[PDB]
Amino acid sequence: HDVHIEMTAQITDIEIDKGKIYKAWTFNGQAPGPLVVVNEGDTIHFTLKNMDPVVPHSMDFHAVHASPSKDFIDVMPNKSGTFTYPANKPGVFMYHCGTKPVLQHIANGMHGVIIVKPKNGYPTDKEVDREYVLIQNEWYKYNDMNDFQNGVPSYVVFSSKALKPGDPNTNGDTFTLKEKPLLAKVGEKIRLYINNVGPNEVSSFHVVGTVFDDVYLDGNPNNHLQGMQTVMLPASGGAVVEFTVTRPGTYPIVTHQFNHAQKGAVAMLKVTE
Amino acid sequence: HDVHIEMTAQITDIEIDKGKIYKAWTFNGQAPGPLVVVNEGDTIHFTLKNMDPVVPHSMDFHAVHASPSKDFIDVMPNKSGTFTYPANKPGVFMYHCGTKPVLQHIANGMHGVIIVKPKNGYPTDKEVDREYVLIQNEWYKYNDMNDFQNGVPSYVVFSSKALKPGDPNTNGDTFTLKEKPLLAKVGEKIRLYINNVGPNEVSSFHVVGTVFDDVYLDGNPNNHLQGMQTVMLPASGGAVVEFTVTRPGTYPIVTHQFNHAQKGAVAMLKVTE
Amino acid sequence: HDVHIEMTAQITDIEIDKGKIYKAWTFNGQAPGPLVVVNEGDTIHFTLKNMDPVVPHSMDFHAVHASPSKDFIDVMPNKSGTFTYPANKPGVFMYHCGTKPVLQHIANGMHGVIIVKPKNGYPTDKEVDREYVLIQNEWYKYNDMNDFQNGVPSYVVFSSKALKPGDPNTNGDTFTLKEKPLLAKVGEKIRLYINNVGPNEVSSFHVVGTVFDDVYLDGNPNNHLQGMQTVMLPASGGAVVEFTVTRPGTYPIVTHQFNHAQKGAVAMLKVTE
Numbered sequence: 048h049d050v051h052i053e054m055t056a057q058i059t060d061i062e063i064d065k066g067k068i069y070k071a072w073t074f075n076g077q078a079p080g081p082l083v084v085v086n087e088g089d090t091i092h093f094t095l096k097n098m099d100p101v102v103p104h105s106m107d108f109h110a111v112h113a114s115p116s117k118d119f120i121d122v123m124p125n126k127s128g129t130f131t132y133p134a135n136k137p138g139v140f141m142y143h144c145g146t147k148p149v150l151q152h153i154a155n156g157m158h159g160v161i162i163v164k165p166k167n168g169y170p171t172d173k174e175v176d177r178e179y180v181l182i183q184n185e186w187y188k189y190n191d192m193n194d195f196q197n198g199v200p201s202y203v204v205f206s207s208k209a210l211k212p213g214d215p216n217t218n219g220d221t222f223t224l225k226e227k228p229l230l231a232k233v234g235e236k237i238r239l240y241i242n243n244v245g246p247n248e249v250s251s252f253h254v255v256g257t258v259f260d261d262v263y264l265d266g267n268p269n270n271h272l273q274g275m276q277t278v279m280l281p282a283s284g285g286a287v288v289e290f291t292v293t294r295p296g297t298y299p300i301v302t303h304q305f306n307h308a309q310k311g312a313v314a315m316l317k318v319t320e
Numbered sequence: 321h322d323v324h325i326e327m328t329a330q331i332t333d334i335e336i337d338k339g340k341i342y343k344a345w346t347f348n349g350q351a352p353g354p355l356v357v358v359n360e361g362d363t364i365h366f367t368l369k370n371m372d373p374v375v376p377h378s379m380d381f382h383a384v385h386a387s388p389s390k391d392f393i394d395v396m397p398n399k400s401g402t403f404t405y406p407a408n409k410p411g412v413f414m415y416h417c418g419t420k421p422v423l424q425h426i427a428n429g430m431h432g433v434i435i436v437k438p439k440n441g442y443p444t445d446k447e448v449d450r451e452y453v454l455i456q457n458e459w460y461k462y463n464d465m466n467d468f469q470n471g472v473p474s475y476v477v478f479s480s481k482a483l484k485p486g487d488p489n490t491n492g493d494t495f496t497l498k499e500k501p502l503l504a505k506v507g508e509k510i511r512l513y514i515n516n517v518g519p520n521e522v523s524s525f526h527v528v529g530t531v532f533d534d535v536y537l538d539g540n541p542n543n544h545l546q547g548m549q550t551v552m553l554p555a556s557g558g559a560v561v562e563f564t565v566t567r568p569g570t571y572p573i574v575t576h577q578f579n580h581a582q583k584g585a586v587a588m589l590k591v592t593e
Numbered sequence: 594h595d596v597h598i599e600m601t602a603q604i605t606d607i608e609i610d611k612g613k614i615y616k617a618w619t620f621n622g623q624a625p626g627p628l629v630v631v632n633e634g635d636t637i638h639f640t641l642k643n644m645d646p647v648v649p650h651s652m653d654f655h656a657v658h659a660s661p662s663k664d665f666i667d668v669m670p671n672k673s674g675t676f677t678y679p680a681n682k683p684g685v686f687m688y689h690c691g692t693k694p695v696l697q698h699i700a701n702g703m704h705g706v707i708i709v710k711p712k713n714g715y716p717t718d719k720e721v722d723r724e725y726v727l728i729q730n731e732w733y734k735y736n737d738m739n740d741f742q743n744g745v746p747s748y749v750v751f752s753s754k755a756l757k758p759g760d761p762n763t764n765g766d767t768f769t770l771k772e773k774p775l776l777a778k779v780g781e782k783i784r785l786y787i788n789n790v791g792p793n794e795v796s797s798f799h800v801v802g803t804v805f806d807d808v809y810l811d812g813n814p815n816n817h818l819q820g821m822q823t824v825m826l827p828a829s830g831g832a833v834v835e836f837t838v839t840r841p842g843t844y845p846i847v848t849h850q851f852n853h854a855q856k857g858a859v860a861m862l863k864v865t866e
């Protein structure tokens with residue numbers, strides 16, 4: 048129940064659209080950052096190693112109870128910081144750099160998801176056959192604060208982060224989850240752990256060709272909805288969603304705010320017999 | 321049991337604002353399209369007859385479980401296509417054309433609502449005196465993909481679709497439901513089946529002069545809220561909302577995102593003794 | 594109980610950003626307006642005295658059942674009007690000027706919150722140690738209808754309104770709740786009564802360093818969520834949110850739509866031993 052987690056902050060080139068490279072600010076060389084998974088009640092001992100020689104970075108986990116001005120503080124270039132705090136609430140939480148201006152650090156790529164598994168799981172656990180994590184984020188004009196604050200996103204994208212060995216692990220880009228769809232089998236109930244990290248947009252989350260059997264808002268098992276076509280996610284908003292795929296084919300996964308879908312936010316689930 | 325539905329795709333001029341005609345892409349000569357009502361558990365046998373001589377069109381019902389790559393496929397100009405799928409979930413679901421670019425087809429007018437009536441209705445059925453269906457959509461600069469992707473809506477609008485003969489059946493425009501308000505009587509509980517089809521905006525749905533006694537998110541009877549002033553609808557989001565009108569007068573119906581209201585999204589409800 | 598409330602409509606200079614003065618349209622010389630607090634079941638006898646010499650004004654309370662065309666009607670310059678209506682529903686409700694164009698009156702500053710206390714309070718009343726009221730609003734280019742309808746907000750801001758002597762009572766501005774943080778003590782469970790009055794944006798409401806233990810949507814005790822990281826508020830949407838601060842320090846309060854936080858929407862909560 049004491050968990051020890053280490054990440055680096057670094058600058059990494061990410062191909063966010065075909066032929067379009069963004070010099071992203073990242074945790075562990077991915078944007079969004081690596082998945083973190085803990086159990087409800089765990090105490091996290093988190094170390095951030097700042098490998099950006101130019102600017103400070105920090106870590107804010109939405110899962111934890113912490114003092115932001117003591118526990119989410121900036122770690123200087125080529126220094127490390129270690130912070131300890133509990134994850135007392137089950138669900139699907141955003142994490143991100145909390146260095147001012149926070150919009151600048153998030154928009155440049157410093158966001159991710161931490162999942163906190165509920166003590167007694169979900170009441171539909173037994174029904175689920177397969178699970179994946181999906182994250183939505185936006186990309187803007189490169190490190191352009193005016194665009195971050197006042198412009199529309201250049202791209203809106205999905206990525207998937209591995210829950211277990213063999214799961215895809217991808218970055219937020221307009222194509223990878225079209226070219227290499229997530230995989231499932233006919234008749235399966237799929238669970239997706241989803242978070243919209245923004246920075247700026249809300250998400251109207253919809254899987255084409257199915258209906259969500261069960262939805263747990265922010266992944267807290269108490270927040271139970273049934274039979275939703277589309278799940279409204281605020282910026283930083285999470286959910287656990289579950290649905291059945293009844294026939295073979297490819298099922299798009301979108302935000303239904305179609306300007307964002309048009310700008311990259313469509314992932315594919317390939318369902319085979 | 322088995323329901324057979326035939327609709328056409330065609331181009332239809334729609335006066336979306338006073339003296340402003342939009343050459344809309346439509347189902348059945350209306351934008352949004354005609355209301356479709358079925359019962360929970362029905363199998364739908366849907367035929368789309370494409371009467372557009374230039375562009376393919378298709379049909380995605382949010383109500384159904386289907387293989388999108390087999391059952392939501394394009395129907396070529398001057399052809400028909402028939403697809404069969406179940407509607408196993410109660411609620412107020414969006415439908416729309418699913419032809420790429422989907423944003424273009426939705427924005428041009430190819431959207432609508434299908435209601436799936438719950439097996440046992442709603443726990444508040446006995447309390448309801450009167451019902452209407454309202455849909456919110458946006459209009460952009462005519463068939464302008466840059467405007468669709470990056471621009472603000474030119475108009476945001478409500479329409480009503482007839483559940484009963486002599487309910488109003490209108491298109492998405494800025495003026496019809498102001499000039500010809502919906503009708504009700506003092507003391508009645510009113511139910512609205514509502515959906516925000518977008519394409520791009522979320523909706524903050526509010527009836528002036530009342531509070532929603534009961535709300536069922538996406539029209540599923542299990543998703544029950546009470547005493548809401550305003551209902552957040554994602555793009556494609558639906559609800560069943562119920563409220564009492566206590567006094568004679570005219571009650572505006574709005575999205576409380578007032579930029580949208582100002583750009584046309586105000587309908588009126590005239591309540592008389 | 595019969596409650597008698599009076600406010601004046603007037604023009605008031607407000608420093609919405611450091612060194613930036615907005616000639617606001619206001620209730621009682623504040624924007625947002627003064628807090629109103631009543632009990633569920635109260636009959637409100639409200640008088641508006643319009644001291645604007647040129648423009649009519651009005652009052653629409655989301656809390657009440659009323660005829661908008663009789664009870665929310667315009668009051669002419671230098672005149673008064675008195676209107677009587679019940680507040681039958683518990684929660685945190687927006688109020689605002691209902692004079693056309695409503696977008697202009699809201700955007701210029703004529704918005705506020707009325708709290709309706711539930712007849713039997715909230716099931717978590719016993720756990721709550723301290724309470725505050727926070728309101729989110731936007732500001733645009735001064736009285737510029739094109740910007741109101743089509744532009745991004747220039748500032749997005751929080752204000753606090755007083756429940757008791759010593760509670761901050763502030764205007765919507767970019768700085769006051771940063772310079773003068775809300776106060777709390779380590780270990781306290783804090784209740785916030787919150788409303789996003791818009792006019793145009795939704796809000797992704799989040800307290801940094803904590804998780805909401807309980808959330809009551811629109812402040813109705815029945816609309817109960819648990820363990821939310823972030824609360825989605827439509828334009829005009831309210832909530833009662835409760836959270837624990839476990840450690841000393843300063844905790845930012847944000848909308849997590851970070852373009853808006855960047856443009857002013859960050860308040861501070863300073864937690865001491």
Ligand SMILES: [Cu+2]
Pocket residue numbers: 072103104105144145146152157
């Ligand atoms: Cu950073």
Ligand SMILES: [Cu+2]
Pocket residue numbers: 107109141143283799801849
């Ligand atoms: Cu955050």
Ligand SMILES: [Cu+2]
Pocket residue numbers: 329345376377378417418419425430
């Ligand atoms: Cu089409």
Ligand SMILES: [Cu+2]
Pocket residue numbers: 253303380382414416556
């Ligand atoms: Cu759809």
Ligand SMILES: [Cu+2]
Pocket residue numbers: 618649650651690691692698703
């Ligand atoms: Cu006014």
Ligand SMILES: [Cu+2]
Pocket residue numbers: 526576653655687689829
């Ligand atoms: Cu209002």
